[PDB]
Every structure is written in structure tokens, then in C-alpha cells.
Design a protein around this ligand. Structure first.
Ligand SMILES: [Cl-]
Ligand SMILES: [Cl-]
Ligand SMILES: [Cl-]
Ligand SMILES: [Cl-]
Ligand SMILES: [Cl-]
Ligand SMILES: [K+]
Ligand SMILES: [K+]
Ligand SMILES: [K+]
Ligand SMILES: [K+]
Ligand SMILES: [K+]
Ligand SMILES: [K+]
Ligand SMILES: [K+]
Ligand code: NA
Ligand code: NA
Ligand code: NA
Ligand code: NA
Lengths: 502, 502, 502, 502
């Protein structure tokens, strides 16, 4: 009943550790016990094992490398089929399997779980119509609304190219010269930048999406996932201490929660707005640096999910999980958010580099809907039979069905094109008085409704910018003072204690 | 009933061919029917299909790239358990599933099946004790007995580095300076170099292996797979005409034979010799350029196999098939043939590069025996679950079994070592009088027993070496004359007609 | 002095072929000359050499795998700065270094040069504004005008998924159900499908491009490279016979021409038309299955190029060469031809798969213009220094320049957009009377201007389609009848000779 | 003049952040400034940039992933040509460029530089006879003397397969069941396990090597690199506190020292013994868990080196640095140390996976000696010319030189072989009285020459093993008691304070 140890080709071994050698004769030695001589090329059992060891590592995710995952279940609790025709949403009580990967953004594989960063909150829905990936963050906004900036931004959040050190000069240099970032910089430097538990943070679509009901009518949609335990944060000092005591604290917190039977859960809501309402708003629905104010666009519950099952093997199920915003179902479509648009290409592109072209044959990534793609064949590590003899083009010798086209309803026309295609840069140095700082001003007031939050924000910025040199510091005070002047000045005063000038 | 056409994530499509575009207004045009404008990045269906198309190709085999394959069944017909304790051999009537790949050596993926070359004949036995790969050729000898020469030799059989053309001058320059090659050269240029059908040629281990019985006694073994249809060949002109009319002839011949129920079959024999017999022979059992004479080491039948099932998908089952001499079972071990010894390393090495580290999880390569390698984990495209939570070392928390070592019997000791390790080159320029030219002379005598074979052999060499320059041609005549001077002169005469001088 | 033979780390070897072994004692053997025993893992020279050998192969191009190349020189011979501000065109007599690769389409790397196929004619211009790639074929049209059809089409031109054989049934099944293919199909089965020499064929942009002058005015453009030796073709039987005798005929022809100094050269022309002209045509300038009639849009010479330098290493310069339509200069832009659009993505995508992310650091692919991409860093096999310590974002610490944007002149506006984005399928079954069959009828009349070309065309089709089943054959006869009924009947008659019915 | 920002193909860009879109008409909106619509596939500048970003990451090293490096200079100070004929040692004052990489072992990228671990101390010497890699550690011993154990051991030093957390249970389960490990375990849990600075640690060959002089006489060698600043360590609490404050401390420490001209240096010594002396010792020179006592084998100085130049780009020079013990020069050979032997295969094996087959063409890895390997050609990312048209085998048409064989002097013959090859396991449960515990007892006494070192050792273990379960704890106490019982008692006392029992 105990399994036989083997080689990769399945032949039983007789000793796990012994290896083959042309023994030297040492019988006359003071210590003749060893049997030692040059190793032999024919020791398959050894070379098999060393060559596999030598290839264990695959490239880490270019961002969001450090992660933790679980499986679970999503359940419809309200009817929203007036908004969305999705089959997994079409019945109250209908359940769907999910897999979630939580992550930080900037850190590599050995980095701390408690670092200041946005958190990835990425969920795969295994539906009867295909795998739906909701690739969300723990924040409803982001630093950019121009997709060309992401390599620049991410570089400045990581390490200097000569030293391999983190560098506050470049970190802040990028942000003060691309000032659309300020809304998410404030959220990042609140205490939500250091959640106390992955079970105690929210997820947000961030982007606007477009959902279609069975009549072909579409609305714009924001999605909100709210922890049933609420948002609970560490502060800057707690998080930094924990980084040196348990860099894997959140991984274990989630795992142990699930082993105990204390399954974390989330409630799911949408905001919706019509094209006619969008035209009336002071912000674009395509602007990822904006939220939709709750008073004008209230949240509407539609479901809940629970993570109740730890992975059996982390590398196979978590490290190898692939999520893409372009993995959708017919009723849920991307908006023209420039950042989302670029994400549609970027995830599959990176997946093919990191995992291989057939990465969706890896079990965690397999759809449960039947996949039928006759024209997509071969590629490295084809393990699913490659559709056998099925013709590999749209053929007369093989029948198939297509769906009927979701025809857009005249009641809700698609957006009308302007007269030409153009290039556009939606960013840079912005005016203090424009609506681009009004949401950051609103975030400051939201801080002020909870005692301690404004002071923590200013302290969290100061300990970080104190490391940058004095000229960058000054640009940073101006930058926050474009929100409210008192913010930049409270930060300047604390930075001057930490970083003296004389 | 017909399957729905989908994308890679399982989402049904509505149109197989339509693609998204920012349409230009052409309503006032002379022909206003087209709807054309710049393509949109958000067309996942399209980009999904093209990105997969762009990665269809995996690297081809460095040698033996062009092949054909079939599944079948091997059956024990005689008891040789006195020679070999293998479980798949341990009962007359016992059947084992097999997979065979046939191939040429030098040619690439679109080369002619009917070209002059050795033919590969590699079979995977899916046994209870693991996958046994018998990686054989259609010749019992080979060009080399020094492993370092294989890159040298193979390069001269392929293309000039500057022109990408075949080059008679390097082809023959290699051979006349490494004269251990002549035995296999004569076989190559006999009509067996152009088999009429893969169902009508033999397979041979070529190397000596060492097989062990339940008592731990071992003997040297040569293996012979003889077609139940006999050896049937094309002549040089048939084979060359076919290169242009049907370069896939053998591939279709095998496939059609199986489709119509004419299942090809082979009978399996061994030759055996003890260490005491080996010590008396004029040749080394470790010399791949040597056969064992039949009158002295007669063939002993043990089984048969039949290829009776075509692949469903050529790429997934044939192009991804991986074979290695070092994939064996405990009762069958390699001898110290230096060429075989380096093949133990080179095939798994090249497999990892061509297919990926986990290529034994591709279905055709999967063992049917239970595989248990707790210390070999992760790597690209882990699709078998990666052993779940099983500890990844030899641990107390997880019990396992090993086999008992096959203790070598004092009645057949292992070979005794000399005093020191050393470096050795077993080739180069050789003496006409030595035993290294004796088995070539015997092959000449064997040609002579069938009318036309001696004539054809000289013709087959002549047409090839006439493309070399005159100084090389001279060395070639001189090389064949080390066998019998009649041979070199007979070839010189015909080469002079084809390649006039002065 | 002659160089020292080394290992890969530069250590001089003492013997090229000797290898290290734990020698067996065979002093008492009849033949004791061998020094043979198991090979040692510590033989770096052996293993280093075999491990490299094991990794020689990279994936072949998914199409156009079989190819031949040469470096040369483009020279401006007429001033066209009224049409195009490209710097490499800005002076009569300006010389630019080029690299050209020719190829077939469906054949793999070992396949026949003389096969019936379109030929690729791809040229890289190393200009002071960047590397411009003109990725052209030897035909001015192509089988598709929907980018999604390419994988389907190419698959049908290649091998059956189960048998790995070419398959006339799928070949013609695709063509007869996607009837826009017929113009290029007729070009293919003319004798231009079997050129006698890469030196004796033309190149064509095929797609419409859009070229801009210093004022921002733009015109649609078609480029023609006409061989100074004119177009010379084999007939079907010569090509088939040469497939068997010299599958590398074209490669040797090109190489030997340059070796002996008979440098091939082409003369370069453009056709041009304005947006206003385009609106009057019965064809779209975005339709790759269409040409521009010569008497309406006459050729205008602008230069010439000569191929005068053979590669020194085929693998390093030809096999690793990478071309993309999206590698362009600022004054030359793509049109909304839907096929050309998808090619902008597909080629850099497949390059990263086939060659690695940093394939443009491979010497043949390097630009001679200074590259400065601070935000594009790292990746496998960074060999160019990786910009040293240069910041990896757009920074205040590193000064840089950007050119000015070519502002589109109000004289020649960009194309106006329609109201909405949409999905379009530009093909399928077409009406015989429509203009989609008019340019095919004209090609027939061009064939008629030369005795035998019409009958040769029908013969070339018949011998190919005779292999397909009788239901496919029937569809093919109607297909060609849609051009003119006499064509379908001529082909039916000969196929009946070859493929009897009764 | 400042450089022009370009695309990868060298075309200058006009704007660094603007991207193309099919703009939606929002002229009527409350805020009509945005120009936003779906992104275009033809935006090469964007897709080029994103596709490169998507591929920045290569696999991290399977071990020693976290690292820091610098260039420098080695200088001969004393003559040892009586021991070694290396050309780089043959003259007093001779200088050789070096590159050094330091690293931890277990930690991934992003982990703490201050972690308890061995330190990699790895150095590449660019000699005129080839690149010599001295792949050393900061300890003269290691955990194993059986190569098959390295994957087991490393796995237990890293993360649990299910949770992805470090696991003290598997960490100690491996060590107490393979008790040859204890010598290095004591060194690891001394304060040398947490150096204060990479500049303040020693390096050691660990393995015995064999060095040959010009007469062919060889001795066994051990190499010692002693920091000119001495060995300076943190205590456990300092190490841990620093992990949270500055996980990149050692990296910055080395960089800034060099930046400010405080170049670290090391003095280089050897121990040597003849085969005659080795046969008298209580330990095998092939045993990596042993040192040579200084009193019997005193250090002999021969040179020094200084790190005086920081890398310009960390990824290109440090991350892509590749070292291997089998990169050597003819006068420096490996011993039959079983661990060392397996390292000769394993490092190039992983290099080809991690960096590609042609990784020695990456600048930091290039030899400065002329490399000439005609039989090693092609492969992915061939960037050095591939030897042009040089023949790719040992050819009559290319002259070359080989060096003379260093023929072993009969005054120092090679080791004599026993009768047979065999398999062997040199570890497991060991007897307390055997010599395998003598050097650990001696290390205990070394600790006791300095106040508090014995107590710090026990504390450093106890805080680690306190996290294991009580049965594993009990086994750790017995394990250390096999050295001296007082050691286990002390550890048990402190563990009980941290891990109380009922
Ligand atoms: Cl406050
Ligand atoms: Cl590899
Ligand atoms: Cl004859
Ligand atoms: Cl890729
Ligand atoms: Cl004590
Ligand atoms: K948002
Ligand atoms: K495809
Ligand atoms: K043989
Ligand atoms: K497609
Ligand atoms: K055209
Ligand atoms: K040692
Ligand atoms: K090689
Ligand atoms: Na011994
Ligand atoms: Na239209
Ligand atoms: Na001998
Ligand atoms: Na606008």
C-alpha cells in the first residue's frame, strides 16, 4: 500500500540516495570506509533527478509575483438579469466554482506579504459559458489612465537598474510628473495600503465594463467585492515589523483560516449607469483614476462568494494560475477604458511567455465549458489530445454550431465614433483647480471622518519621501498641496524632522 | 449535437471569420459594400487565434526529424526468463502496448521519406515496471565508436554552414579520415539504404546491452527485430524519382496499410554471449562498428509485435514522442559501449530542450506504471497535479517502498576495472590488414551472394562521390580499397565516367 | 598561426575526439587494444559538446520556413520626395545596405525549392531612421482579405492532422468555400507558381501602404520590384522533376550567382493614388485580392537594388533573420487593409516565440540607426549592455529628444470614420457577376496573350485537383466556371483523363 | 546632443506616452476634454513596449537567487608554480580581471539579505587560458557528501509544497536523518550564518581540487580567501531586525563601499597535501563535511583580489552571470568529491535552462581567451557570428592546433581504481563516537575560545527549532547531543522556554 519510489519513466528504484561511481582503491588508507571515485554518466537515477531540479523555476509574474490562493464557490443572491444575461447569474441560488489569487504588486517571490502596495484580487469563474476572469485590485482606482505608462510606472516602483535597490527618487519623480496618479497615491498611502488580512480587504473592478442583457441592452458597470469581515488594516509600523518577523503572514493567515473552517466570504455589488448618465458626469467612465460617487450611483447586491478550499500544490495551482481580463463571456464586455484595453492584449501575451502557449491546458486554468477551437492546434506541451483527427479549419467534413449574435438594441446604441483615429496622452502636469483633483479632495474628507486617518496618511507619506533627495521632496509637497494646501504642508513639516536641512 | 465553436477560454463565438474594425465611412464610394477600417486590439477571438498560430512550431529533432508512427502490441512467444527477469517477458502470451516511431536521420521535416539514410526504429514498451525505450536503427552497426565524433559526423551529413547545401566534400572528408566508419558506410550504400517500405525493414539494437535474470546473472545481448515481410528495397533510381513524386511515401504506406487492416508485424530475437566468450572474440562487444557473427551467436526467438493503430493526431502523438536508451527497466542495463553511454545523457537532455522538462506528462510519453518521484517537482507545464501535498523529500511523514537491489551474482561478476581512468580515442586512420576491415570484407562477400548487390553498391557510392572534388574522390577509392582493392577500382571507373578528368 | 581548439569557456583542448572512461581491464582478451569502460560525468569537453549539439535547433518559421538570403545595396535613382519624406530616399544616388530573404510558403525546412507556391521576397533596409522591412511576395494579391482566415488557409495548404500528409481535399475545400481566393489561386497555378530562379521573379507590396511627405500630404502606394532579368518560370513537370534531383536548386542558384559575380538586381517602382481617386474605383484599396490596373495607375521608378554578398553563416544571418511589416519609418504607414493590419501584430509576436524577446540584438536584425528605448529592458539574452545605468522610465534626470509629429495636411485628411465599430466578414461564396471575379477574368485574358499559358494553367490545376474526391472536384469546376465557364470545362476534361468516373 | 527616443527597430518617436485610438464622439458631454475610444492594433509603439515588458523576467536561479556583484582585479603575490602551472599565476605581479557574485542560498529574489544562510562567494577569472570559475561558499564545508541529496535538502530549506510557507519540521527532519550534515549545521547556526557585510566574510573552495604543475605532478588543494577586513557578524536579533528595515542591506553595503572608493579585498591561500599524506588522515579528502586542520596543513599565500568596479546594469551583468565549477583551465582539475562531481554537470545544465544554450555569449560570461569550437554551432540567440563559414567538424580544409597532453608524472600517479564500479550512500544515521563527529566537537571548542559564542550558537538553534513540533524537537536535541550532550541540553532548555510542554 505505500507507493514505490521510481524514476521519471516509472521504473522502481532500490535505494533513494546511493549513486554510481568508479571507486578508488583505499583499502590501505587510515579510513577505508568510504567508497569514492568519479561519478558515472550512466547513473540515470541521479542525472534524471538533478536535471529536473535544475529546471524547477519558471519566470515569476512581471508584476504581482508574490501571491496566495484558494478555491471556493460563488452564489447568486439577487436577480440582475435586467442588466446581464450571463448564465451563471441567471438563477437565484445558482452556484459556480471559483479560484482566487491574492497578491501584492511590486515585490518579487521572496518579498514581504505586509509591504505597502495595492493588492491584487483576481478571481476565475468556471462557468458553463467559459472561464470568466475578474482581475481586480483592492482599490477602485489606479495610478494611470494611459496604457503606455505602465512599464514606466512599474519600473519606478521596483529597483534601480544599476544598484538593484529600491529608490524613492525615481518612485516620486514619476508620480509628481504624471499627476493623474495622485488619487491612487492617496489611497495607497492610507492604511488600506497595508491590509491586516487578505480576508479583510475589498476588491473592485476599477475599470468600467459593459454588461448586456438578453434584449441586447447594455449599461456601464462597476463591480464591488466587500469583505464580510470589513476592511481591517495594519499601520505603517506594524506592517514593517511584521515584514521582518513573518514575510509570509498573509499567506498563512488565509491558509489557516481555511484549514480551521473559518471560510472568508465576500458580498458582490454593482453600480450601473447609462450612456445618457455618463454624458452628464464631470468624469469619464473610461477614467480609471475616478470612482462613481455612491450617492449618485448606489450599490446593488447580486451575489456572494466564499473561499473554502486550500490548494493541494501551490506551484501547480497558484503559481501556474493564469488570469486575463480578455477571458470573458458574451454578455460581459470591456469598456473603452484605455488601460483595460491594453490589459486585453498584455495578460495572454505574458501568459504565453511565463507558462507556454498551451497554458490553458494546465488544470487550474482549464475551462469546464467544452472548448472547441479546430483552427488552434499544436504548440509546446499539447497534453489534451489536440482534438485528435478533427479538421483544423472551418470545414465541410465537420459540423458545428455558432451562437446567435447579441444584437445591440436601438434603445441603447453603441458609442458613436468621432471623425478620425488619433493619438492622445491623457496625463502629465495637471491644474490644481480641475476636476482631476476633486476626487482626491473628497478622499481627504473621507479620511477626516475617521479619527487618525488623516494623520496616518501624512505620516505614511513622510517616512517614505524622507529618503528622496531634497529637490524631489519639494516637488512632492507641491504635488499634494494641489489637493489641499494643508496636506503638502503637514507632510513637509514631518519630512523636515526626518530629513534635516541646514 | 454539433459542438459549439469557442475561444480558448470556452466562450462560444457567433461568427468564425468576422473581425472587429473601426470602420471608415465609404458610403459615397463607387463600391460601398466593404466595411473596412483599423483593426481593434479588443478582438480577443482574432488575437487569440493568431497568437496560438504564431507558436505552433516546436523545435524539430536535431536528428531523425522526419518520421512516422503507430501504436501496437507486443507479445511474448518464448520464455527467456533465464536471460532476463523483466515482468513484460515473464509469461508466454503476455501482451504489452507499444508505440513505434520510424524515421530517417539527416533530413528535416519536409525532406523525402525515400532518401538514402539509416532508418530509425524506436519503440516504447508501456510495461508494469516502467516505460522501456528500445531506440534502434535498421542497421546493426553505426558510423562511430567514439561519442565525441557524433556532432562532427552529423554535421557532415547535413548542410554546409555558409550555403545551407549538402556537401559531398565534407560528407566524404569525414569518413575517409575516420575509417572505423566503413562498415556502416557499406551498409548505407547497399540497397538497404533505400527501403521500399518501413514495414519491410529490420530493427537492431546495434549496441550490446546487459540483461539480468532473477538470480542476478547477466549476459551481453544483441536484439534483432525482423520484418515478417522480409527486407525489401528500392534501387537508387526508384528512390530518387520517388523523392520528387511523393516525399511522404513511406508515411502514407504505413498509415494506409494499417487503415486497411494489413497490420505490419515483426519477430523478435536475441543473441547472447558470456563474458568468457566475449574475451575470446576478435572484436569488442563494446564496438558499435561490429556485428556478432550468426554462426557463432545464433538468434533466439522471444516475441513478436504488430503495429495496428494509427495516431489520431500526428503532432500530439508522433511529433511529441520522446525516446531514450536510458529509459529502461531494472533487468536491462547498458553496456560500456561508449556511444550508448553518451546516448544515456544526450536524449533526455535534448528532450528537455525540445519538449520541456515535464515532457513525460505528454500522453504518448506517460508511463502506465505508477510514477512516484516526490523529489522531482514543479517546472514548466506541470499538468499532473505535481503530487499534491506529498512531501518533496525522503521524509518520515510519508512512507514508501523501494525494491531490493539486483545483487550481481558471483557466478557472473561485473567487469573488472583497470588501474586508472584514462582518455581514449578509438578511431582515425586504420590498417587495411586489421580486424576493423574484416567484417566489411565479409559484407562484400554477403553482397556477392545475391546477384546485383555488389554492382548496385558500387553504383550507389559512385553517383554520390562524383559530386566531390577529385582529391577527395581519390581518398575515397583508397578508403574502399582497404576493404578489397576490387571495390575501390570498380568505383573509380564509374566515377571517372560521371566526373571526367583531363 | 592556426587557432587553438577550445572548450566553450576558452580552455585549450589537447585532443578533439578522446573521451574519459573508467577503463575495463581487457589485457587477457584476444583483442586487448581497446581501452573501454563506463564514461565519466567529469568529461566536460564531451558533455559541453553534446549539450550544445542537443540544442542546435530553434523552431522553424510557422510559414516561409524554407529560405535563402543575401546582403545587398539599394540605390535611389529618381526623386520621389513629393510622395515620401523617407530619409533613405532623400537624395538621388543615396545608397542603403539591405538584406533579403526569399522563401516558399507551405514547405518545411527540408522541402523542395521548386515546389508550387507563392514565394516570399522580404527585404530589410538599414536606414538612418531605423530598419524598414518590406515583407513582400512574388505576387501582388493574396488568397484572403480577412485576417482570421489565415490559420485556416495555411492549415489546408499544409498537412492533415492525423496522417501528416498533404491533402488535396482540404486544400480545395477551403478555396471553393472562400471564393475571394480565386484571383491569387489563378496566379498560383500559372507558371509563376514555379519560378526558375529567385533571380528571375518580381516582388510586390501586395497591400496598399500610405506614404507621407514633409508637408503631411499622403497618398496610397503600391510597390513593385521588377527583376532586371525578367520573369522566367519552370513548367509543372520541370519543377516536379527538379524536386527529386535538387531540392535546394534555387538556394544554390542564388549563392553561385553571387559567388561568380553575376549579381542580381531589381528596379523599384510605385503606383500612387489619392483618397479622391480611391473613391472612384470599383475595388477597395484595402482589398489584398485586387491589383491597380497599370494604364490607370502607371508605375513610377524610384530606385534599384543589387544582391552582391552571400551570407558567411546561414544560421546566424538567414535562419535568425526577422522581418515585420510593423518595422517601418515615420513617413511610411500601413493602410487599413485588414490582412496588413493583423500582420503588424503577428510578426513581432512570432519572432519573440521563435527567437526570443531580444531578437533585434541578433546582428542581422540590429538597426544601424541609434536605438534608445529606456523603458524596454532586460529579457532573455540581453547582449547589448542593456543601456547600462540609464533610467528605465521617462525621467527628469536623463535628457532626451523626440521628433516632431507629421501633422496630417488639411489638403489630404485622414479617412473619416463611420458611426460605429463593427465585425465584418469580407468573404465566403460570391456572385459570378460581381467585380470580385472581374480581375480574375482579366488574368485569363493576360494568359491568352501568350500561347499555351491558358492551357498550362488548366493543366497545373488538373494534376493537383485530380487527387481530390469527385465531390470536391465538382465544386472546383464550378468555382473556376465563375470566372469563365470555359475554364471550368477545360479543367474538368483533363481531370477526367486523370480521375476516371463510371 | 541628447539621444532620440526610438522604437526597438530604431524609428524615432514623436511622443513617448500618446497612444492610438478610434476616438468616441463626446463633444456634447459635460466634460468633453477626453479623447477616448477603443485602442488600435496598429499602435506599434505601444505594443512593442508592452510586449517587451511582458517578457522582462527570466527564471531566477533555483538556488542562490538573491545576489550582489562587482568587478575587480586579482594579482599574484607569491610563486606557486611548484604547485600549479596556471598561466595566470606564472608571474609575480600579474593581474587578472575578475567578476564576483555574492548571494544567499534559500531566499528567492526579494528575500532579506540579512537572512541566516550560507553565502555564495563566486568568482570568474578572465585568464588567457580560459574563464575559470571559483564557485565558493563562505564556509569550508557543506551539508552533504552525496549528490543525490541536494534536491531533498534544498527543498527542506525552502517552502512547503502545499502552503508555500517555510516549515521547520521538514527543515529539521531532513538534517536529523542525514547526520553527516551536522558540521555545516553548526557553522550555519554560529554567527557566521549572519555576516555583517559581504566585505567581511571569507570564502572557501570547500571541496578538494587537484592542481598540476609543468612536470605533471599534482597535489590535493584547498583554497581559502580571507577578507582583509576580517570576519564580522551580526547576532540573530540584529539580522532579523534588519530584514524588515532594509532587506537589501548587503547589496547596498557593497555598492556604496565601492562607489566611495573603499574597495574590499581578500588575501588568497591554499592548503596542499600529497596522495601519500591523504592516505594517513582520519578523513577523506573527498569528504565535503570535513576540513583540513590548520596545524597539519598550514595556509600558503599566493595572491589577492580587490572588487573596485560596480556593475553598470544589474540584470545584464549580475542576474545573467553564469558560473560553473567545470569552467576551469588545464592545470586545475576536480577531485572525486562526489558533490563536486555532480556540480560539473549541474551548473551548465541549469545555465542552458535559465539563460539559453548560448549564454557564454552574454558579455559578462564571454571569455577573453580566444574561443574556437567549430563543432558547437547554431542554437538560440547566436550573436557572435557563429564562426562564419568555418567548417563545423574536424576537417582537412581548416588547420588548427591542439595543446600537449599534461602527462601524469610517475612521481605522482593518479588514484588507483578498485575492482568494480558501485553504488554508494555515504550518509544517514551515524555513530556518535565516529570521526564524523570529531570536527563538530572541535568546532564547539573553537566557539568556546570566545565568550558567548557557544551560548549564541544554542540560542540561534533554539529560536529556529522552537517552531517545530515536539517530536521533531526531541530528535534535534539527540542529534546535537551526539557532538556533546551539553549542547543538546542547552538547546532543549531554551526551546522549552519558547515551546512549553504539558
Ligand atoms: Cl487625523
Ligand atoms: Cl534546457
Ligand atoms: Cl553484382
Ligand atoms: Cl512568447
Ligand atoms: Cl554552555
Ligand atoms: K474606477
Ligand atoms: K490558430
Ligand atoms: K553491433
Ligand atoms: K482565426
Ligand atoms: K494588391
Ligand atoms: K572541506
Ligand atoms: K556540438
Ligand atoms: Na573503501
Ligand atoms: Na460600406
Ligand atoms: Na586494453
Ligand atoms: Na473630446
Amino acid at each position: 500500500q505505500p507507493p514505490k519510489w521510481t524514476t521519471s519513466n516509472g521504473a522502481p528504484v532500490s535505494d533513494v540516495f546511493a549513486t554510481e561511481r568508479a571507486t578508488f582503491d583505499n583499502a590501505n588508507h587510515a579510513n577505508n570506509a568510504p567508497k569514492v571515485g568519479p561519478l558515472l554518466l550512466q547513473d540515470f537515477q541521479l542525472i534524471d533527478s538533478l536535471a529536473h531540479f535544475d529546471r524547477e523555476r519558471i519566470p515569476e509574474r512581471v508584476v504581482h509575483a508574490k501571491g496566495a490562493g484558494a478555491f471556493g464557490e460563488f452564489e447568486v443572491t439577487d436577480d440582475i438579469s435586467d442588466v446581464c444575461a450571463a448564465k451563471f447569474l441567471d438563477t437565484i441560488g445558482k452556484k459556480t466554482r471559483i479560484f482566487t489569487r491574492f497578491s501584492t504588486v511590486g515585490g518579487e517571490k521572496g518579498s514581504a506579504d505586509s509591504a505597502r502596495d495595492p493588492r491584487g484580487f483576481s478571481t476565475k469563474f468556471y462557468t458553463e459559458e467559459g472561464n470568466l476572469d475578474l482581475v481586480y485590485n483592492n482599490t477602485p482606482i489606479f495610478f494611470i489612465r494611459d496604457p503606455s505608462k505602465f512599464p514606466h510606472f512599474i519600473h519606478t516602483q521596483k529597483r534601480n537598474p544599476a544598484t538593484n535597490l529600491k529608490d524613492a527618487n525615481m518612485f516620486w519623480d514619476y508620480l509628481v510628473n504624471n499627476q493623474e496618479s495622485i488619487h491612487q497615491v492617496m489611497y495607497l498611502f492610507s492604511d488600506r495600503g497595508t491590509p491586516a488580512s487578505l480576508r479583510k480587504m475589498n476588491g473592485y473592478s476599477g475599470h468600467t465594463y459593459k454588461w448586456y442583457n438578453k434584449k441586447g441592452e447594455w449599461v456601464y458597470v462597476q463591480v464591488h467585492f466587500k469583505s464580510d469581515l470589513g476592511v481591517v488594516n495594519f499601520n505603517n509600523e506594524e506592517a514593517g515589523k511584521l515584514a521582518g518577523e513573518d514575510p509570509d503572514y498573509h499567506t498563512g493567515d488565509l491558509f489557516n483560516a481555511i484549514e480551521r473552517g473559518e471560510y472568508p466570504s465576500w458580498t458582490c455589488y454593482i453600480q450601473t449607469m447609462t450612456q445618457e448618465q455618463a454624458a452628464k458626469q464631470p468624469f469619464s467612465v473610461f477614467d480609471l483614476t475616478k470612482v462613481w460617487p455612491h450617492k449618485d450611483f448606489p450599490l446593488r447586491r447580486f451575489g456572494k462568494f466564499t473561499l473554502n478550499e486550500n490548494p493541494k500544490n501551490y506551484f501547480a495551482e497558484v503559481e501556474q494560475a493564469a488570469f486575463s481580463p480578455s477571458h470573458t463571456i458574451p454578455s460581459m464586455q470591456p469598456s473603452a477604458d484605455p488601460v483595460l484595453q491594453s490589459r486585453l492584449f498584455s495578460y495572454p501575451d505574458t501568459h504565453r511567455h511565463r507558462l507556454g502557449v498551451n497554458y490553458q491546458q494546465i488544470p487550474v486554468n482549464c475551462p469546464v465549458a467544452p472548448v472547441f477551437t479546430p483552427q488552434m492546434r499544436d504548440g509546446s506541451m499539447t497534453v489534451n489530445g489536440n482534438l485528435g483527427s478533427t479538421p483544423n479549419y472551418k470545414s465541410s467534413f465537420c459540423p458545428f454550431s455558432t451562437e446567435a449574435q447579441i444584437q445591440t438594441n436601438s434603445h441603447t446604441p453603441e458609442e458613436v465614433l468621432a471623425a478620425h483615429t488619433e493619438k492622445f496622452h491623457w496625463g502629465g502636469i495637471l491644474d490644481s483647480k480641475s476636476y482631476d483633483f476633486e476626487q482626491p479632495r473628497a478622499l481627504w474628507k473621507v479620511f477626516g471622518k475617521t479619527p487618525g486617518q488623516q494623520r496616518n496618511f501624512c505620516h505614511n507619506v513622510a517616512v517614505h519621501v524622507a529618503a528622496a533627495n531634497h529637490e524631489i521632496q519639494d516637488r512632492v509637497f507641491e504635488y499634494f498641496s494641489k489637493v489641499y494646501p494643508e496636506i503638502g504642508d503637514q507632510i513637509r513639516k514631518e519630512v523636515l524632522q526626518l530629513s534635516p536641512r541646514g
